[PDB]
Write a structure and sequence with these properties.
This protein is an alpha/beta fold. It has helices at 23-32, 77-81, 97-112, 134-141, 157-170; strands at residues 7-17, 45-55, 58-67, 86-92, 122-128, 145-148. The protein has one domain: Rossmann fold. A 6-stranded mixed beta sheet has the order 2-3-1-4-5-6, sandwiched between helices. Strand 5 (122-128), helix 4 and strand 6 (145-148) form a beta-alpha-beta unit. The longest helix is centred in the middle third of the chain and has 16 residues, at 97-112. The structure holds guanosine-5'-triphosphate and magnesium ion. The site of magnesium ion has 5 residues, from helix 1. A motif (Switch 1) lies at residues 33-47.
């Protein structure tokens, strides 16, 4: 006797934000349980896979697209965004200018990507490096929620991803 296979959801998720805010470190902590203090800049886009045992009958596979910080100044984001179901937009709490870039990334995303029915994709805001007004910002810029995160100390990355996936499931 075999047990029945689990239902599966496969989601391509974007991780965007300006240089050095911690996008790659968030993904590396989430998927590989690892962190590095050395800064190695992403070139173009890198990828990582997260398998989530969502509930006893369900598996969620996340294809994470780790986009480099300078790409909002290029012309590749529309290609990079294609077929994504959700995104994290990231800034660095220690460098407030990176918060000002959050709206630029959000407008870039919303102008180049929408769900098949025309609804904008689910987006969660990550205030990263928290180891070192937000509600109003999320309501005014169309975010489903926000979290203080730390790739170094592993704070709220699991929680923020679960929040994003919950919203994606609810809007399919
Ligand atoms: N203290 C602290 N440092 C962090 C955290 N996350 C990332 N860093 C550091 O911030 C620097 C930049 O991290 P990256 O993950 O490479 O940032 P990025 O957004 O991927 O940068 P680009 O790929 O160039 O756009 C690295 O030195 C990391 O060690 C964090 O949560 N806390
Ligand atoms: Mg990177």
């Amino acid at each position: 006797h075999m047990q029945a296979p689990h239902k599966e959801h496969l989601y391509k998720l974007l991780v965007i934000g300006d240089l050095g805010v911690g996008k790659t470190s968030i993904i590396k902590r989430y998927v590989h349980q690892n962190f590095s203090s050395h800064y190695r800049a992403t070139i173009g886009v890198d990828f990582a896979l997260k398998v989530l045992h969502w509930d006893p009958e369900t598996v969620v596979r996340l294809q994470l697209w780790d986009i480099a910080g300078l790409e909002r100044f290029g012309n590749m984001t529309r290609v990079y965004y294609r077929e994504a179901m959700g995104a994290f937009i990231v800034f660095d709490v220690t460098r407030p200018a990176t918060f000002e870039a959050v709206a630029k990334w959000k407008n870039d995303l919303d102008s180049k990507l929408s769900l098949p029915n025309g609804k904008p994709v689910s987006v969660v805001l990550l205030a990263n490096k928290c180891d070192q007004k937000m509600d109003q910002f999320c309501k005014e810029h169309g975010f489903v929620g926000w979290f203080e995160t730390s790739a170094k100390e592993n704070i709220n990355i699991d929680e923020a991803s679960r929040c994003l996936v919950k919203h994606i499931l609810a809007n399919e």
